[PDB]
Amino acid sequence: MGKSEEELSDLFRMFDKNADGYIDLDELKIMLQATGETITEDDIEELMKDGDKNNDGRIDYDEFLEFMKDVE
Numbered sequence: 001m002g003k004s005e006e007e008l009s010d011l012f013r014m015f016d017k018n019a020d021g022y023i024d025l026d027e028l029k030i031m032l033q034a035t036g037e038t039i040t041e042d043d044i045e046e047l048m049k050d051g052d053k054n055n056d057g058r059i060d061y062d063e064f065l066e067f068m069k070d071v072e
């Protein structure tokens with residue numbers, strides 16, 4: 001938070017699971033598998049709608065930077 005694009009770049013690394021460069025809804029499920037939660041596909045897709053400008057069902061590094069640039 002605090003209007004920082006660099007923080008968004010670091011957080012994107014936390015979201016991708018295969019080191020493939022794109023966050024897919026299934027890579028996002030692995031983050032919930034780490035918490036031990038079962039996720040429905042819409043929960044992951046609604047999270048993408050907040051910041052994914054394309055609404056493509058996957059967050060690119062650039063789409064991820066768009067999600068929380070400001071948070072202030």
Ligand SMILES: [Ca+2]
Nearest residue numbers: 016020022023
């Ligand atoms: Ca990925």
Ligand SMILES: [Ca+2]
Nearest residue numbers: 052056058059
């Ligand atoms: Ca996307």
